[PDB]
Amino acid sequence: ICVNENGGCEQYCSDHTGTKRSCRCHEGYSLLADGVSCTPTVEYPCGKIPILEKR
């Protein structure tokens, strides 16, 4: 599943038993109930530009 369009994940993707797929996030982010989207849990998460995010 992960092989194609990142298994629908925003960040990381893990394959399991058959057609089971788990999305995950980098440290400083948590996964939303949709199971694909990652939301920041910290003030300065990695790979996001505060001055651009604050517009």
Place this chain on the structure above:
Amino acid sequence: IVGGKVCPKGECPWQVLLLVNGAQLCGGTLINTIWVVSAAHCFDKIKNWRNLIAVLGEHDLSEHDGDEQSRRVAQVIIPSTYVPGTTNHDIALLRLHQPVVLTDHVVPLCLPERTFSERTLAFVRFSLVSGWGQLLDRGATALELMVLNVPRLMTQDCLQQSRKVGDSPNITEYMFCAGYSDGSKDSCKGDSGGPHATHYRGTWYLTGIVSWGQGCATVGHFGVYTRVSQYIEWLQKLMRSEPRPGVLLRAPFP
């Protein structure tokens, strides 16, 4: 950076400036509060390991505005496979003596997972390359942080599109080509160790390190970057390690 533009202050917040005795050495990328990733070739001629400084939040080299943060580089970690004076395995992991403070001007770039990086990031065409390197081949270095958008090539295409030059190193599986063959836009020697940053679904990631080429913005030639995805496990294992005495440390690769 040749053919780029000035990176607006705070839009390359993970960019590191490496200094030795106060002099411009290389670039680097911040991946968390205490680790910086740069190029192994940046440290080939170092004798004064205690005079290595990493500057975060830097933009204009002529003025101090208060957003700059200086830290001593406490450890330089290089792969066992890297040979000084050569091109392959061009990566260095730097441990800051004390953490940097995350602010609007100092933010890490995400070190991605190998899988994600190889099967998703490796296919994003364009990426940003940045530094205070020379503005032209045999030209003066920039006083303001410069940024350039460059397209990534598959190695087969790079080798086909390039002008067959002798003694020119091979493009290994630990490298990738990115840039332009028309002599208009490139990264340069002074940008060495700097980030090649990839955008994916609202977040930026570390895909490459400014490594080498056949002259800055040479026609028929692209810029060569260290393929960071190959070093994810190697970096992670070391960031989980306790500091060891001595600045330079050579670590087994793989």
